[PDB]
Amino acid sequence: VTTYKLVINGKTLKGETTTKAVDAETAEKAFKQYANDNGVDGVWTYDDATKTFTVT
């Protein structure tokens, strides 16, 4: 297991968080739940070297 990060660049929400997952696809599902749970809907981009997601 490894730890991934996300950057949030939404209208009223802006910040970062982490979770732990085995693949990036499972992490993508976890961050998608978080963003939806807080109302954020945007465009997703990924960087594998930093293991960081970011939605805008």
Partner 1 sequence: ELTQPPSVSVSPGQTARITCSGDTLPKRSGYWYQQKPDQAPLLVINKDTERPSGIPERFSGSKSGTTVTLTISGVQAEDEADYYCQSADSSFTYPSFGGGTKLTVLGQPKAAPSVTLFPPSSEELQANKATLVCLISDFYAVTVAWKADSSPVKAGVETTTPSKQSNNKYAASSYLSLTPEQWKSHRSYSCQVTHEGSTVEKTVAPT
Partner 2 sequence: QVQLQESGPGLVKPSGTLSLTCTVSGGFISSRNWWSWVRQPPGKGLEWIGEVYHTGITNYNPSLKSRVTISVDKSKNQFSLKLSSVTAADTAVYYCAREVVGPTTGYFDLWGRGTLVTISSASTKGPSVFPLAPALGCLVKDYFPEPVTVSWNSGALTSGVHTFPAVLQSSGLYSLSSVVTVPSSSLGTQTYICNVNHKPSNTKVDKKVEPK
| Binding positions for partner 1, rule: CB under 8 A | 36-39
- Cβ neighbours of residue 3 under 8 Å, at least 6 residues apart? 18, 19, 20, 51
Partner interacting with residue 9 (select from partner 2, partner 1, none; CB below 5-8 Å by kind): none
CA distance 11 to 48: 25
C-beta atoms surrounding 35 within 10 Å: 20
Closer residue to partner 2 (CB): 7 or 24:
7
Contact with partner 2 (CB under 8 A) among 38, 45, 50, 56: 38
Residues near partner 2 (CB under 8 A) are 8, 11-19, 34, 37-38
